[PDB]
Write a protein that binds this ligand. Sequence first.
Ligand SMILES: OC[C@H]1O[C@@H](O[C@H]2[C@H](O)CNO[C@@H]2CO)[C@H](O)[C@@H](O)[C@@H]1O
Length: 300
Amino acid sequence: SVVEEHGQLSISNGELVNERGEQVQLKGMSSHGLQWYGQFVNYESMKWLRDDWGINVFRAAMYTSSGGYIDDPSVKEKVKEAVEAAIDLDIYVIIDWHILSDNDPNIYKEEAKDFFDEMSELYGDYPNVIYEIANEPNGSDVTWGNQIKPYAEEVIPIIRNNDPNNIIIVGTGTWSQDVHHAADNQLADPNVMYAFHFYAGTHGQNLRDQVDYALDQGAAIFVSEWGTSAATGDGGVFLDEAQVWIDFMDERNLSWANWSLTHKDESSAALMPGANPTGGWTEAELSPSGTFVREKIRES
Ligand SMILES: OC[C@H]1O[C@@H](O[C@H]2[C@H](O)CNO[C@@H]2CO)[C@H](O)[C@@H](O)[C@@H]1O
């Protein structure tokens, strides 16, 4: 129903809109690393998230390093499983080239270009797909102008040769927080968005003001990852600040995916140890984070 109704997504005046020009807000879940917690990514779990939580997007977080794709490329097949499930379930899907320790997206740029060539060749005639080409550029030696923008200007053409207008999300500096610099030096492609990531354990008032600055330059922002935890993915749950961010995102038409769908013993994990990898979770099988996130999506 979601993808049939909204169809082709695009950016209009810095906003994500559907094929009839109406603003649309995506809200869903990210997997954790597919090399570690891939069992939670399947048609049945995604159907349960769609039906019971109300998700309309799913993010497939394919780590490149940390035992991910570069080390063992078999994980690309799990991305394919996820995309196919989203197509079957009529929801949107984010294909995330999930850089992190490999902090400069240029490190694996050749591999990224080949990967996105393949993905866009396979799926480029479906409206479900959103390409996230570099999760979290980070480090003082990785800047928008010198590293990230030129990387994007190599990878985007590869995608566009197969898929001329599905959305592409481009990571920003400082673990996808530096939307200010991106917004002042935007990419040419009209269907690009810049990633912004937050963790509720960080006091967020200036970060919200920076997102507003970026929006005011006409840049579109996708909150492609956020957590209820501290920035590590752990360290307690911060639901008061998470709610402030939720309300902020609603007011600003910002789409989002929550980190993450796993049973790992960390505060950001949505599931308890014991949760069935194919869905059907009772309230006792959701963590405090998962309970909150599910409520936010159901409310929406
Ligand atoms: O892989 C290191 C670490 O990653 C955390 O997840 C991060 C994600 O990869 C990028 N955005 O920030 C989040 C939080 O730091 C996981 O939560 C950890 O379990 C994992 O060890």
